[PDB]
PDB file of C-alpha atoms in Angstrom:
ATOM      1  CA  UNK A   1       3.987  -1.614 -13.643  1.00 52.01           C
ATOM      2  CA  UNK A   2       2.621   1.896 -12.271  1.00 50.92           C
ATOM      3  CA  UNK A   3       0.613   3.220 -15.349  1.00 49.20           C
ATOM      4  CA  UNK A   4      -2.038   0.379 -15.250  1.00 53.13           C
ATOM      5  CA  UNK A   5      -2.575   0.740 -11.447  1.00 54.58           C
ATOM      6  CA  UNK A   6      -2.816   4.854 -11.932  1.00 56.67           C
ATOM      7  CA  UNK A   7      -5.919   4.078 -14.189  1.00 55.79           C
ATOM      8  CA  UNK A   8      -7.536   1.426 -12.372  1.00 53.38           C
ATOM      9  CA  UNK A   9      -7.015   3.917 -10.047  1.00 54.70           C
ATOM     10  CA  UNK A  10      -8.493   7.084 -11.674  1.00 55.46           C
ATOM     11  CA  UNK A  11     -11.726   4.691 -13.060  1.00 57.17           C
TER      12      UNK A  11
END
């Protein structure tokens, strides 16, 4: 579970 928390990240 790394992609989601990248985005949420990036936004």
């Amino acid at each position: 579970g790394f992609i989601v928390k990248r985005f949420k990240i990036l936004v």
